[PDB]
Amino acid sequence: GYSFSLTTFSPSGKLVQIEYALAAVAGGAPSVGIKAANGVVLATEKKQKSILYDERSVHKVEPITKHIGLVYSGMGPDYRVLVHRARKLAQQYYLVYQEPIPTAQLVQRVASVMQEYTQSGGVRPFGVSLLICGWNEGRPYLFQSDPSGAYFAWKATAHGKNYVNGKTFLEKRYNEDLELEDAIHTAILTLKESFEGQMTEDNIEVGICNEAGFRRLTPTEVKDYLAAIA
Amino acid sequence: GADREVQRILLELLNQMDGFDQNVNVKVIMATNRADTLDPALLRPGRLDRKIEFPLPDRRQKRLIFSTIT
Amino acid sequence: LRPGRIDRKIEFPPPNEEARLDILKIHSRKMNLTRGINLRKIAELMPGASGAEVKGVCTEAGMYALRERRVHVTQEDFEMAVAKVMQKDSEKNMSIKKLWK
Amino acid sequence: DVLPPLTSDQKPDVMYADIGGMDIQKQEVREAVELPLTHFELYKQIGIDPPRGVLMYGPPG
Amino acid sequence: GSLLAKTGQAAELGGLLKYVRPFLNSISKAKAARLVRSLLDLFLDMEAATGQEVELCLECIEWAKSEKRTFLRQALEARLVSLYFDTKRYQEALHLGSQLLRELKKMDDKALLVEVQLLESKTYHALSNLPKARAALTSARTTANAIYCPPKLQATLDMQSGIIHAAEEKDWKTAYSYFYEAFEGYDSIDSPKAITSLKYMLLCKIMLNTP
Amino acid sequence: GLPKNPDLRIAQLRFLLSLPEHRGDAAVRDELMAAVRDNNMAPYYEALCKSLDWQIDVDLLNKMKKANEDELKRLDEELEDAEKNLGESEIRDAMMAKAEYLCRIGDKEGALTAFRKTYDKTVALGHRLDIVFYLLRIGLFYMDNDLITRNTEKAKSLIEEGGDWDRRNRLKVYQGLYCVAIRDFKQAAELFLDTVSTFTSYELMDYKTFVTYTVYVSMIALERPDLREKVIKGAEILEVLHSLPAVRQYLFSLYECRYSVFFQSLAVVEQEMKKDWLFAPHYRYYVREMRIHAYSQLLESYRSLTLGYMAEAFGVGVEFIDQELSRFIAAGRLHCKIDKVNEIVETNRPDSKNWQYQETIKKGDLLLNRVQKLSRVINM
């Protein structure tokens, strides 16, 4: 189809390559991000091909700023290049405006770079779906960006493998007045629903944005939530 | 042309699926390796009556298969 | 389409509420319905039906009746048949609002 | 006189006994096709256009 | 809870479970969930049947539904249906199991849905209605096929599958293998009911006329 | 669901009052008048109070009568408005309300005539069957057999046009009920068996009572293999019998040849058979038939046996069972004869060939007499 070239339109008006990128998305790692009354919780699985893979060596939740946490859909190396760009962009905004980058604005710049990669005839977009949690002016924000350059705001959402079940889960297993603890419980529950196989401190990692600051969970805390609970 | 022809193949398959007349007791069954693909138009419930999974044999099932052949 | 050639055009838009009612009644005429069936609600719960998918929904209700060896259909059968024939169970999240708006 | 009255190896000569115990799949397909191929007239008196298609999915062999 | 249960002081629990309710409200709802699950498990598991078996469960259903702890109430009701099945009360067991299935169908909580359908199949088998038990077992089978089954859940499901496949006398080898998997799972979680499976295991081999 | 008009619980209580052993019972006055005043059957209460020794509930009877008159007045004015100003659907609803209340007040002639006019002017076939079902319920409530038969054939004729499945299913239960009312247990058992899993006639009576009727009629009507395949192995039947051990024992004892327990259960079940507002007129017959069937079962596996053996098996004494076999053999219901000197029953059941010959010769006369009467078409 009209996918071998990125800079041309199909007769129906679709640029097939970017929905191919979105098909690469949701085939990767499952992950779920929800917005609670106070904070924002992003959870992702850590399950490798073999037990030799020391998973703590490769974090997936990355703090862009002390107030921003970032998770991806599963496209590892593309996520790494994009997260480097996002970190540098956040630094530029932090120094230019002398204020920390807004979550929505940070997602806007990241999606702008994403769109910049959605042109020309000799490059390809990063097939990564990005979940961004942040705190701005006392308000919590959860945003999702996609390789097409578009971005949106979600109270709760999920992407990766078996994402439709996560969507239904956050449809009926959610209310906007969730406390932080119950928010992490909802996140690990939808992770259990979406994932295949059990989890321990090894198999999940979670980042939580609270208005004081963001922090990625230690694996011990990840087991505390996932195991002996739910 | 190959792409257009495979699309016509799919459309003719659906037309025959809906087109085989009543009082004909033909059954049509399709095998697949992935099933996460496959056009939902073919997965339309008006012509799909059951979707049966055949995952890799695990414990018990592997034991049963080995016993049966052996 | 050039004038001296084929002369008339006809549009076949997706069936509306009344059309969905008529298709439901027509195809379920042969079906063994049960008191308490309210086909109007099923028609309302199926916006943007394609007409043929209404035949699909009645066939699905009949299939639910069959797999339980029942020769009769109820409102509940059609209601959970809607859940399968809604056809956006594989949709509503192929990223439509994005990159197309 | 009037006398009193299959294409290939299509007849496979394999039984459920030879099957490696896919019991759940056995039941699923048996309801899916075997009853329709045996008793489609009852599913006709239901009026539902008795079954036409089922999907087989899994790893290759 | 553990010390008051294992020592047989469960008669005092009738106050303790009521003493901690505001405490359960103050702390996170899921922490209260874990504590309530542990307390009810430790209570019902022993011989402490003393005039409060289904009563405390009843007012805790009321407490959870009033506090909008709906999911805690459905889990508690699944435990209550299990108790009802144990108490040979299969009629009301069917009633609560059915309505629990309806609400669980309002949501998409397959994890408890498989257990509820499993209990439905068990109580249908207890009432000699083999077809309904088979249908419930098949529904639970697909629902569990959706997710990865924990060893406890997998063992229970396979034990019931073997029981049902034995209730039909047309074949025992598949029932034998199902009991084998159930026993393997139970031994893996070291649950006592393993011996029960181990019994049914041998039963099949006696039924296969190959002792 | 279908409306409970007329209410057959009222008929059951009235029939119970028709029995002298229960006319002195005060266990009915609490509930029957509870519904009697609610449904306001002025004609039926008037018939009752001048027939079963009970008398006027002054305020209840006054509210009864006056509410019936004023309700009929408003129904009449609404029907008149509908017929003068509204289409056939609104008049349909108006006369539905009129006939429904007229049956509600148990006015046999009034309900009959109102449902009659409503049926005559019915718009379409869908409403035709339902009126027949109301009138069948009224006929059963008064136990008017001729009305029941005519309504049954009317429903048959109207379903003949291709009525939908719901009316067809309900007609099976109604027709089986009719067959029970007319000692036709052979067809009643098959009708009840066909709808045991599809029974939805709550307006008549509950499901457990239906399965009791089913097991009652099946044992008398069906032979042992059919009893095994369609009742013993009928999953829903055992499912409901787990809640009803009393009839489960009565069935299993006959099937498992536990004849003494079977006789105890049959003696018990004869009481409910008698109290039953529909099963009473045939009750003795039913109680009789099982006996021979029971005997016919026990004598099946023996060529000869001492009377003491069956006496102990049925938990009865030698003289009683001897008299029972005397009657039943005298009636020709058993193929055995008694050597009272040694006190031994001895079967004389014909073999397959001998039975075949006896049926051949019997049907031979039943056909040859028909031919002979058909003869003399020569020389009129």
Side-chain angles (χ1 to χ4, degrees), chain A residues 35 37-38 40 67 103 134 138 140-142 210-211:
Chain A
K35 197 216 302 187
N38 34 39
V40 195
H67 270 219
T103 319
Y141 295 86
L142 183 140
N210 96 77
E211 300 310 295

Side-chain angles (χ1 to χ4, degrees), chain E residues 150-168:
Chain E
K152 179 166 55 187
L153 187 34
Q154 178 65 36
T156 53
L157 168 47
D158 281 58
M159 160 157 90
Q160 178 75 355
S161 192
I163 280 172
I164 290 293
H165 233 294
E168 65 88 15

Side-chain angles (χ1 to χ4, degrees), chain F residues 120-252:
Chain F
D120 299 337
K121 331 185 294 318
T122 309
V123 180
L125 178 68
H127 267 330
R128 301 277 198 186
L129 256 299
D130 205 318
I131 312 302
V132 191
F133 287 118
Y134 303 96
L135 194 79
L136 275 155
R137 287 197 293 274
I138 311 148
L140 286 164
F141 177 86
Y142 298 103
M143 247 314 318
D144 199 330
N145 192 92
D146 176 50
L147 269 65
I148 285 160
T149 60
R150 282 189 274 110
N151 298 173
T152 301
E153 207 47 42
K154 190 172 183 171
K156 280 276 305 308
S157 311
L158 291 163
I159 287 304
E160 179 172 325
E161 296 195 30
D164 80 320
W165 169 92
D166 166 272
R167 275 85 172 181
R168 204 175 306 169
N169 181 64
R170 291 172 201 268
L171 162 150
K172 293 174 183 182
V173 178
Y174 279 101
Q175 167 180 137
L177 255 298
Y178 154 64
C179 291
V180 152
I182 80 158
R183 206 180 291 191
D184 178 54
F185 299 123
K186 198 53 79 152
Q187 268 71 349
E190 163 295 335
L191 291 160
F192 286 165
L193 257 48
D194 191 67
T195 89
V196 47
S197 55
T198 80
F199 163 85
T200 171
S201 311
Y202 312 154
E203 88 282 2
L204 281 168
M205 40 76 68
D206 59 286
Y207 189 38
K208 294 192 188 187
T209 294
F210 172 75
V211 75
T212 51
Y213 280 7
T214 326
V215 53
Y216 290 176
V217 58
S218 47
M219 281 175 28
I220 177 176
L222 330 170
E223 100 300 330
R224 179 175 179 83
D226 256 316
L227 193 37
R228 188 200 305 121
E229 321 319 323
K230 271 197 279 304
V231 152
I232 287 290
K233 296 176 186 179
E236 71 301 338
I237 298 175
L238 306 91
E239 186 191 328
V240 297
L241 279 182
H242 273 284
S243 78
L244 182 42
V247 187
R248 200 182 192 277
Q249 174 191 77
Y250 167 60
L251 171 45
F252 280 51

